[PDB]
């Protein structure tokens, strides 16, 4: 169950009750389409059905030529600025490089001779699940060869014409996608891997039962965190690498920290000072530490499960959580920014709304059946989503999340009142409680 | 008519003459597709036309299964950093939640029994326009039932095979979109809602005539500001919620503020100081105040109409406009940032170009038929788009907008000259005229 | 060959050996589809093949009506914040404006009467390559006119029904794309311009042989840097402007600068100070200066060729490169930011990994066949990709690029040790070596 | 040359509709000749077309 606490003292709110699903590594799979080698198409037939087959075959050939151009290129793609820099498809591309080595394709080819799904050991030693999802070589050779391997074509039935267009379409769409994404696509579409194929791939994957269940019940999220990397087209084989998320952390507690500016509320226009907790984002317990995702928009929430990517995280000591109940705690130096910009806004939380209302701004909360039920005064305040449908701050209407769950309003003195505006450092974008303190003392020592 | 004024004193320019179209709220509509309940497909027929029908029916069934997986998940998605945080589909999702309640679908179902368009009152009390855009239940039951509700299939004509593929295609594409977007799409495609259906929906909407006209003449913009939210598939009904923008503010004056760095131009390399107005973006008059959109890229301009979203705005007193004619005005504390980074660049405006030219940079403006017609000297300067096609600053060529309209060059002393570099605070990212002043005095008091 | 150097003194690394391909200008081409003027469709025939033709014709007519709505709207779309602001399709839109002038379409129309590819001089004087990619007027008039210009329809063969759907599909997809992108698309899809058409357009373009070769071997990148702009649909002609990149700078040296925070490593928690080189990004030699791209994600790397856009660059003196071998050099004031935020992270480079390891973070580098082979101690360090497959910093696993190439570890004293923490200005987001120095002296003078 | 592929193999390659019609046209003459011989005990007069 989702619960939420608002801290009046620091103009912030924490939503608890979420369970983690963190992408920690990558699985790489090789997806293959078996192609037919087609040179000239031998026919003088002006028959309309032969003509449609020949047009479809030209589309097929142009698709192959197009992909051949692509395989000749190396495929590539508050506190967010503190993040490191990864190379998201380095793992997929490494596998893709191996597929260009001599006889490497042959391994794949003979392995998928009897079945359409096999585990192949590549030359470098990595084992990859390999899958043949479409056999155009077989279709073309068994249904289309008679109609154009001979000058006097045996005219195909209308149903064959339609069927070939259906089969070839997937090749055209895959090529279509690779062509406007420079050989790397994300999310992985159902053309790259159908829902059936993906579920089957997940089920045949060397992963825990929890991971299989998690991935199977959230394939749409799996798709969004996956890449499809165009690799090789040679020796009647199209191969692309699909890079799937590995979720090495599952079902640990996660919570979302929401923060909003906290300013003094003097009537004197520019005499006010402001403070904002900068450590907003997603937090998940992880291996004795806390995975912190400063850009909460990089996580996807499904019911009460949070899908995040560790590439977009910092690893913090778990004491970082103490900033929520006691921003002045001695065990962790809580991060804040400062300013004199007392502009009004709202932060819509999981179960309510934080409202930073300053100056002459009209700030209210409304129910759909009654209109305004609360008018906010200046300062930072909060309303739960129970009985509330919208919040308005100035000319901005916000709808609140109608998710069920309890909110707790933790009363406390706004900590901004504890500071003397004459020595308050109001130009900090990346500071903390202690940095502001020692800076204040350096101003007082000068006095 | 669009007009534009350049203020030499502050290295900024305002483009006037625009009319507002601000998204202020949301309308939620329920779009339905009537589905056929198909279990086993009874036929031993190896007939090629029966085979194509059976393949199309499998695609249909897999689509339904796919969407069933999706409906089991809760759908979710300079001065920009001052903005609040909304929940963009909270309204749509709230309606989507109601559709999961018992007998709620039945209301929709019986309401659309006689017509394909109706207004339904949901259990919570909200009235939503409901629309049936495709009846696959009817097609399958009346055209396809005989061919597979019996072991000995009555073989369908070739035209039926083609027609079914045409009809079923929309279901497949809708599913396709939802599958790579985790059940929430934006913009709303013509698969979700055809141009005809959307116009019809707009026309049947409970909105003013001005709003209907505005939305109808700009449906492509409406699409981009809309969401489609996958909701339920049960009891032979596919339902998704389409969340349409409500434009509560129309035809008020808007203007675009462009700003560029203003630096001193001493020959001594690092002895220069810089100032940039930070309040660039779109401004629209709105309800006695001004809606300010700091990220001008969040607004879409169509001719002289500006489409913005209030979620990406601050609400400011109208005195903010005074900063354009008098940055030192006593009624509003104009926002600026400071630095010593005198790098060269250009800002292409609505009707010209601002050029910040410093150091050894070559800065020119050219006509296509003649080449260089103006060479800029160091400092901040401006050229109108009349007679000018391009501007070059260093190795960067900019094309100017060829929109028709008059520009006015307001001469004035660059305000950066009024500051003493020895006490100039050059580390402010979020300051103002008054903050820089009082900071300067605190440095002078120490002296 | 790609090589790489790590500077221990400044926690940064430069990857060399790349060749430039910088977009410097734009080429504008007019792409045309010849349309048929179809009013009423005259038939009482309930024949299933006539019915499918009539359904396809309605789709055709709705497409035309849809595009007519679109042509009635004016189409529009660390150190990154230092960049100027361009108008990316100003050139394309200017050409698009000309196409709305009287008789301008007629010029295009008669020019493409004998061939499907011609160079037309527009009224304003600009010469544009013009291309007819699809003739629906001819198909409809020669194949479909008999079946519905007469009440008693001559029933078309099944192959014609299929063929028309194939031909019309491209019109529907083009319209589809324009409809969800407000008349401006990027990348340019194969529906807008097939691979064959694009290559042909490139080959007929008034550009050097090097440019043709470069564009032809990298069409997928060309597509991504191109725009398609919906222009006019009148007098049986659909015309859209395709805006292609001109690469005015080719095969000049480029290098990628990677930077990571450098902090002191005292055991006393908040007693540490940090420094980060802010000038990371791509650098290319360009016309006697250096084109600097602060957002390295705006450049696309294909093997050892870097595709960048000068619109996202600053033009710097070539002395900026001196910051790599000597950050205290007297010829260029090297840019840095400061803080006390000693958080751990890694930067994956072209040929290795920079590791900023501070506090209690576990930082290691591993091989796939052996596990941990290096454990990092606190400070900033580096490992080459030779023999290394992954790096871990806290809970974040990074795969390293497996690109071949030599790395050089340049030993040096971390420059952060040269600063006294008691007077170290740790609040600079946009400073430099000299700015930090003079600021330190102003603190010492107060002492 | 036209009918062998469709039935010398268990999995028939399905013939186009035009072939079906054409074969009926060609075979018809054989059927009519047989028809005539069958009601005339192998001797016909006049000799038909
Ligand atoms: Cl979130
Ligand atoms: Cl909202
Ligand atoms: Cl709920
Ligand atoms: Cl201070
Ligand atoms: Cl804009
Ligand atoms: Cl440009
Ligand atoms: Cl104009
Ligand atoms: Cl100062
Ligand atoms: Cl890069
Ligand atoms: Cl990675
Ligand atoms: Cl390599
Ligand atoms: Cl200081
Ligand atoms: Cl047939």
Residue numbers in the entry:
A (entry chain A), B (entry chain A), C (entry chain A): 27 to 103, 110 to 479
D (entry chain A): 174 to 222
Paper excerpt:
Structures of SC-TM (N67I, S215P and E487Q) and the processed variant with the optimized apex PR-DM (N67I, S215P) were determined to 2.4 and 2.3 Å, respectively. The structures of SC-TM and PR-DM were very similar to each other, with a root-mean-square deviation of 0.40 Å for 445 Cα atoms. In the processed version of RSV F in which the fusion peptide is not fixed, the additive stabilizing effects of the individual mutations at 67 and 215 were substantial. In both structures the loop between α4 and α5, which includes Pro215, is well ordered with the proline side chain pointing down towards the interface of the triple helix formed by α1, α4 and α5, and into a hydrophobic pocket formed by residues Val76, Ile79, Ile206 and Thr219. The conformation of this region, however, could be influenced by an adjacent trimer in the crystal lattice, which packs head-to-head about the two-fold crystallographic axis. The two regions that differed the most from the DS-Cav1 structure included the loop in F2 containing the N67I substitution and the loop in F1 between α4 and α5 containing the S215P substitution. Thus, the N67I and S215P substitutions preserved the overall conformation of the prefusion state and only introduced small, local differences in two loops.
The RSV fusion glycoprotein (RSV F) is an attractive vaccine antigen, since it is the principal target of RSV neutralizing antibodies in human sera. RSV F fuses the viral and host cell membranes by irreversible protein refolding from the labile prefusion conformation to the stable postfusion conformation. RSV F contains two furin sites, which leads to three polypeptides: F2, p27 and F1, with the latter containing a hydrophobic fusion peptide at its N terminus.
